[PDB]
Design a protein around this ligand. Structure first.
Ligand SMILES: [Zn+2]
Ligand SMILES: [Zn+2]
Ligand SMILES: [Zn+2]
Lengths: 38, 298, 492
């Protein structure tokens, strides 16, 4: 697939992790039980 | 009492006979948003406010538009010490007609208003292209879902409503029996057969993000508070809108034979039923999960 | 049979029942128990008829039903009922109401007054008692009725002439007037510019000496503008400076009086940032836990026992130099009276740090009350004050210094910060020459009167005898809720 040659590891900069995320989660909610929807 | 009544009776008379002066309108150059007319500065038990002279005209030509006067709060600098009050006095404008200082108010995000200290004995007023922020009134701070601006709590002829401070948005929420605020407005059902207990009113059933609750028909005056019992819902099951019927299907009594009430599980956005003894929760609950009612310890 | 004793405060009851044990049944009314709820509607509302020889309609408070009830049955197993409320007219009236709510025959009732908790008091209480004073009771009814008429008859006039929801009252309306007058005072204030000139100099030795210009041509030096200030600096720059006089004198500092409700609120506000209501909440906790005396008092008096207790403590913990030959005296008002006592620790031996059952703020308040109480009975602080007079041409300059010699009471209540006179002055004798280093002119402006703070207004009210310890806080809130004044940055 990606044909990588090696693996690299380092600390996570906060801007980097925020760049990963597609959104913030702000409430402890999971899924509704009347209709099984998040 | 003789002295007091002598003063009271005299005060009751018309201003010309020595009676107490009734409040006095002092106009100013401002355009009423409903009719453009000059506007005057008025005091009520609620505070100090901007009014349009059409309030004194009979219904045909009556104007009930009013504006709230947000004052510019003096921010004394503790680091200035004894100077802090003196500089505050220096900060004030001075009235044209007299030496008395002037006190300052906001009318628009473009306009600012100065008023003399001896108002309404002194009629000096000034208007300035000064822009600051304005609050519709004050109370439980809320965020308007339609514009993100601050929302406050207001009172009027219809009791208590909640409105947004941005003059460009009239999105108004409302107060409800067992919650801080209610989204816009919702779908009510009245019951003449449930009497109130602290008041002579009757109970009505209401829905909102908070849940489903009972409320008294003279709501701003009665302000009486309770959740419905399952047996109550069962008794008025025919009146319940089609969705609400399931709550009437819910188990009416717990395994101990205590009585049950209807509650909102905010973490899962769904109604459930619970039982109480001596007004305390029994630690029992039943929920609706896919067309069935399931029950157990809380 | 068993004797029934009735007091106002529950905490005080529990304490009395102790220094008296069984055989007696102590309880408390916990307040008034009963109170008020031509035009008939107006009279029905007021509960008193000014047009019918003041006939009134008292009725148990909607929150004292239990108290009254539980007090009822207790009157059965009681031989002789002892009304032990405060000796003032309010207490006298509470006794009168109890007697008319419990019923029975006059002879079944007795009036006793408790001096202190000491057995040397709770004993003398039943020793030489008496009965309730009808005159005292009627005096309180007269006050209560006058306050009623004003509030229920003036407010309506306001509703008609001004706006609905408005109110007026003997205490309420003058509190607002005070704020209104200060407001107008501030808004009309016009700052006045004035200048000051200080001079840095060197003694014949080489030491630094700061001086302030006080006179020119024998008139107070006070230029109003920069121009005048310059004309003067020009002269001072070329003048010869010489010492005229050096007055060394011993001066003292004296501790203050123990707290009363008003001063406690002011001290808590200035040293702990506490608002009036909060201060009273903490004080209430402390009282109910037996650490201090009633939080509502207008007297700074101290019993002899209290005074021996504190001197005993000062003697063991600080030494002789801190203990005055005889008790420190204060307050000589010839019209003064005697009521409860001043706010102080119930036991001097109890430190704030040992009240682990109290909130941190309550410990801070206790510490404030404690230190004020112990400092009050210690010796004065002693300083050596020095005043230097200097001449320079037609000008007169001055320098003042002070060196602490003995802390006295400030040992327990330190000087938060050094004052302007808490400094030292170099050795110089009359006739000595001074060398000018630099002249610093400073522009200033007079400032407007300070705005009231909650405690500050309370202080003004008590000064004019307007309110009561138990009502000050309540007054400060009512005028706000009614919309007459507002608080911002802790100022009115
Ligand atoms: Zn208009
Ligand atoms: Zn003016
Ligand atoms: Zn909005």
């Amino acid at each position: 697939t990606e044909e990588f040659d090696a693996i690299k590891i380092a600390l996570a900069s906060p801007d980097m992790i925020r760049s990963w995320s597609f959104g913030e989660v702000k409430k402890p909610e999971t899924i509704n039980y009347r209709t099984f929807k998040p | 009492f003789s002295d007091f009544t002598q003063q009271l009776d005299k005060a009751e008379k018309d201003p010309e006979e020595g009676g107490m002066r009734p409040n006095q309108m002092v106009l100013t150059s401002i355009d009423c948003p409903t009719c453009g007319r000059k506007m005057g500065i008025r005091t009520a038990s609620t505070g100090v406010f901007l009014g349009c002279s059409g309030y004194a005209l009979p219904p045909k030509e009556r104007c009930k538009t009013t504006i709230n006067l947000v004052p510019e709060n003096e921010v004394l600098n503790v680091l200035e010490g004894e100077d802090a009050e003196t500089n505050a006095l220096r900060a004030k404008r001075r009235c044209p007609k007299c030496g008395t200082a002037m006190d300052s108010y906001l009318i628009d995000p473009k306009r600012k208003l100065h008023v003399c200290g001896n108002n309404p004995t002194c009629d000096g007023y000034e208007i300035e292209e000064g822009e600051f922020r304005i609050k519709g009134y004050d109370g439980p701070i809320v965020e308007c879902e339609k514009c993100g601006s601050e929302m406050h709590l207001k009172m009027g002829r219809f009791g208590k409503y909640m409105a947004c401070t941005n003059e460009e948005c009239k999105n108004t929420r409302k107060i409800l029996r067992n919650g801080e605020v209610a989204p816009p407005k919702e779908d009510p059902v009245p019951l003449p057969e449930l009497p109130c207990e602290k008041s002579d009113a009757y109970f009505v059933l209401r829905d909102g993000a908070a849940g489903v609750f009972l409320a008294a028909n003279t709501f701003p005056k009665s302000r009486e508070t309770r959740a419905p019992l399952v047996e109550e819902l069962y008794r008025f099951r025919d009146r319940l809108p089609e969705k609400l019927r399931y709550l009437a299907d819910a188990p009416q009594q717990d395994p101990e034979g205590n009585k049950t009430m209807v509650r909102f599980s905010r973490k899962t956005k769904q109604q459930y039923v619970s039982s109480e003894k001596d007004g305390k929760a029994t630690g029992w609950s039943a929920f609706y999960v896919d067309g069935k009612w399931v029950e157990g310890k809380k | 049979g068993k004797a029934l004793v009735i007091v106002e405060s529950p905490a005080k009851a529990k304490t009395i029942n102790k220094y008296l044990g069984s055989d007696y049944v102590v309880k408390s009314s916990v307040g008034h128990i009963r109170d008020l709820p031509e035009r008939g509607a107006l009279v029905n509302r007021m509960g008193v008829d000014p047009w019918h020889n003041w006939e009134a309609h008292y009725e148990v408070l909607p929150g004292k039903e239990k108290v009254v009830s539980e007090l009822k049955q207790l009157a059965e197993k009681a031989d002789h009922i002892y009304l032990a409320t405060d000796l003032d007219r309010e207490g006298e009236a509470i006794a009168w109401h109890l007697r008319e709510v419990i019923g029975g025959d006059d002879a079944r009732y007795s009036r006793v007054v408790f001096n202190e908790i000491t057995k040397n008091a709770i004993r003398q209480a039943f020793n030489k008692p008496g009965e309730l004073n009808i005159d005292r009771v009627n005096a309180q009814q007269a006050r209560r009725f006058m306050d009623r008429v004003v509030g229920y008859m003036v407010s309506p006039l306001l509703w008609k002439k001004i706006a609905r929801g408005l109110s007026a009252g003997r205490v309420q309306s003058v509190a607002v007037r005070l704020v209104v007058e200060r407001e107008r005072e501030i808004k009309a204030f016009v700052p006045e510019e004035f200048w000051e000139v200080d001079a840095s100099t060197t003694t014949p030795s080489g030491e630094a000496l700061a001086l302030q210009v006080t006179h020119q041509n024998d008139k107070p030096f006070r230029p109003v503008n920069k121009e005048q200030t310059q004309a003067a600096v020009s002269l001072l720059e070329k003048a010869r400076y010489s010492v005229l006089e050096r007055e060394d004198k011993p001066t003292t500092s004296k501790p203050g009086a123990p707290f009363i409700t008003s001063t406690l609120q002011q001290a808590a506000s200035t040293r702990l940032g506490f608002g009036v209501k909060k201060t009273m909440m903490m004080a209430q906790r402390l009282y109910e836990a037996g650490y201090i005396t009633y939080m509502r008092t207008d007297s700074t008096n101290l019993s002899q026992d209290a005074v021996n207790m504190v001197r005993g403590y000062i003697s063991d913990n600080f030494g002789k130099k801190y203990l005055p030959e005889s008790p420190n005296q204060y307050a000589s008002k010839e019209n003064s009276q005697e009521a409860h006592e001043a706010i102080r620790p119930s036991d001097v031996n109890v430190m704030a740090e040992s009240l682990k059952d109290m909130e941190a703020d309550a410990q801070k308040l206790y510490q404030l009350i404690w230190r004020q109480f112990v400092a009050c009975q210690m010796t004065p602080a002693k300083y050596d004050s020095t005043t230097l007079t200097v001449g320079a041409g037609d000008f007169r300059l001055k320098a003042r210094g002070r060196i602490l010699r003995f802390d006295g009471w400030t040992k327990v209540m330190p000087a938060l910060r050094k004052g302007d006179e808490d400094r030292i002055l170099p050795a110089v004798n009359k006739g000595d020459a001074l060398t000018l280093v630099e002249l610093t002119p400073a522009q200033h402006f007079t400032k407007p009167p300070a705005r009231f703070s909650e405690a500050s207004l309370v202080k003004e009210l008590e000064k004019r005898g307007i309110g009561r310890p138990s009502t000050y806080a309540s007054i400060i809130s009512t005028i706000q809720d009614r919309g007459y004044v507002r608080v911002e940055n802790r100022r009115f």
